């Protein structure tokens, strides 16, 4: 074989839809989310300690929160007769729900 | 070198967060309004986290701060005790 | 004085769930100043019937799977494929649980993807 | 030597999944989950009783708040079945005394 | 003869009143499909909202139901409602 | 609005009353929320370069708001 | 002859109102609006204060748990001010006995 074996854009998207949809494990790095939490506390409260258990509890709630935000905004994309989703998508949202900021 | 810390939540954790949302093509504008989005949830919870630490006056932050404070908002977790 | 053996209330219900328990934490709770006798029986039928359910799909999901053993997933997968336990529970979160597989029809790639020619 | 006592409806789930399921096991983590539902409900039902009381000026929760309370938060089918089961247990407690 | 009005039932809430209702949101232009989904969604919301209501009255052996009602059974849904008790 | 109130709730319950405040504040409710429902409706058009909104708009946000049916 | 008594914050409101904007007057359903939210705000802060209670082990509401429900339930600023009015109410009322 001489070309390298390449497969056309969206399928290795699709392949990683349905594998990360089987499993369950977290997908982003304790530390660093360890890291983001004590330094926005420590802006409220200085030395704070946090338990393990207590990451772990804001870190499912964070990516179940932002995949429920993904969801509602690529039906919005749909809707606009797209695919790609864009930050108007995510203010649309974040909007409806009363999310605001 | 750190970079606010914010930037640890990288791009290619982002992707497949939006790979289990069902999310197929993803524009290069997106990464920086979701952490903004995300930091402004974050806020909120462990503000009232906090405020539920600092009522009990402990220095500890305990798991049922998060699930209360997470509560409050409409935002029930189930897994972590009560 | 007899001294009758002393059967749980639970035992009187033909019930697994606990009656005594509940009732302590109905007093304790600032539920109301006082609570009625029937009241912690019929919640924990209610307990009970709605724990058996979760646990009967669950158990039918784990065979699909081929597991014999309940874990978390098992449970959202339960949830989420009954209409009305996912509006009971259509703001929670599940630890550990995920979503469900699903892809929107219209963003997968056409079925004529075969001979051409 | 200093010990505590945690309490939760950990063992009586046990049993009913030994009733519905006998070759079947769970895990500790699925059982917290099982736990934290049940502190859920029980906290959403005996608050809409509360309420239901206050607003008619009754002092006393009974079976019959309890019920209304059951009919008002969850939908339909399950609810009907649900009464049935609470029903079916008062009758069994009261005549068995 | 047959009227019964329009159905005797919720097509008596005429086009024109949607129409304003519309206007309250500022919306400019409404297609012909839209009345009948929105009589649909309104019926749903009505329903949830007096069935909680109904549920109240019979607690308390009533065949009255009160204002009271509504608003409880409102305040579950979270839209709480102000200027009728409560 | 009475006669549909009226016609619904015979459906649950029979013989049933009902105070004017009562259909007052129910009326209040639903065009408040016919209200909020038609201005999401309209952002979810206006996101799509429509001016016109359309069925499957209101659908959207009645899903996203939750309030499925 | 027989009567009965319903209570209602409206006089205090009344008061208030003169106090902010001499020469302006109020309608009876805008009383009944601020009836109904006081009642309903008044409902939040104490239940929340007792769920504080009860996670705590605490049977005693103080000053400290209102304190803390109000920073709680509402945002920033508007927080702040409040609660130096409270703290300057218990300040006064604690002193002058």
Redo the contacts between chains.
């Keep these: 074989v001489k070309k390298p074996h390449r497969y056309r854009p969206?399928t290795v998207?699709?392949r990683?839809?349905?594998r990360?949809?089987?499993?369950?494990e977290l997908?982003?790095?304790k530390?660093?989310?360890q890291?983001?939490?004590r330094?926005?506390?420590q802006d409220?409260?200085t030395?704070?300690?946090?338990?393990s258990?207590?990451v772990?509890?804001?870190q499912?709630?964070?990516?179940?929160?932002?995949?429920?935000?993904?969801?509602?905004?690529?039906?919005?994309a749909?809707?606009?007769?797209r695919?790609?989703?864009?930050?108007?998508?995510?203010?649309?949202?974040?909007?409806?729900?009363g999310?605001r900021? | 070198v750190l970079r606010d810390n914010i930037q640890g939540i990288t791009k290619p954790a982002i992707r497949r967060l939006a790979r289990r949302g069902g999310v197929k093509r993803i524009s290069g504008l997106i990464y920086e309004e979701t952490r903004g989005v995300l930091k402004v949830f974050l806020e909120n919870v462990i503000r009232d986290a906090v405020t539920y630490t600092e009522h009990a006056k402990r220095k500890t932050v305990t798991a049922m701060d998060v699930v209360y404070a997470l509560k409050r908002q409409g935002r029930t977790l189930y897994g972590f005790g009560g | 004085k007899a001294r009758a053996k002393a059967k749980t209330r639970s035992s009187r219900a033909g019930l697994q769930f606990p009656v005594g328990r509940v009732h302590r934490l109905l007093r304790k709770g600032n539920y109301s100043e006082r609570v009625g006798a029937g009241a912690p029986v019929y919640l924990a039928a209610v307990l009970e019937y709605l724990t058996a359910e979760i646990l009967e799909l669950a158990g039918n999901a784990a065979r699909d799977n081929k597991k014999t053993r309940i874990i978390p997933r098992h449970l959202q997968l339960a949830i989420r494929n009954d209409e009305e336990l996912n509006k009971l529970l259509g703001r929670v979160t599940i630890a550990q649980g995920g979503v469900l597989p699903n892809i929107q029809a219209v963003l997968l790639p056409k079925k004529t993807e075969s001979h051409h020619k | 030597r200093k010990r505590s006592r945690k309490e939760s409806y950990s063992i009586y789930v046990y049993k009913v999944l030994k009733q519905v399921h006998p070759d079947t096991g769970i895990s500790s983590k699925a059982m917290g989950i099982m736990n934290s539902f049940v502190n859920d409900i029980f906290e959403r039902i005996a608050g809409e009783a509360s309420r239901l009381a206050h607003y008619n000026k009754r002092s006393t929760i009974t079976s019959r708040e309890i019920q209304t309370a059951v009919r008002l938060l969850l939908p339909g089918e399950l609810a009907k079945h649900a009464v049935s089961e609470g029903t079916k247990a008062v009758t069994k407690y009261t005549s068995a005394k």
């Design positions: 969206g998207a699709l990683e839809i349905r990360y949809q089987k499993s369950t997908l982003i790095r530390l660093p989310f890291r983001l939490v330094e926005i506390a409220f409260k030395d704070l300690r946090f338990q258990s207590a772990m509890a804001l499912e709630a964070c990516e179940a929160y932002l995949v429920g935000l993904f969801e509602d905004t690529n039906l919005c749909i809707h606009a007769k695919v790609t989703i864009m930050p108007k998508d995510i203010q649309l949202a974040r909007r409806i729900r999310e900021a």
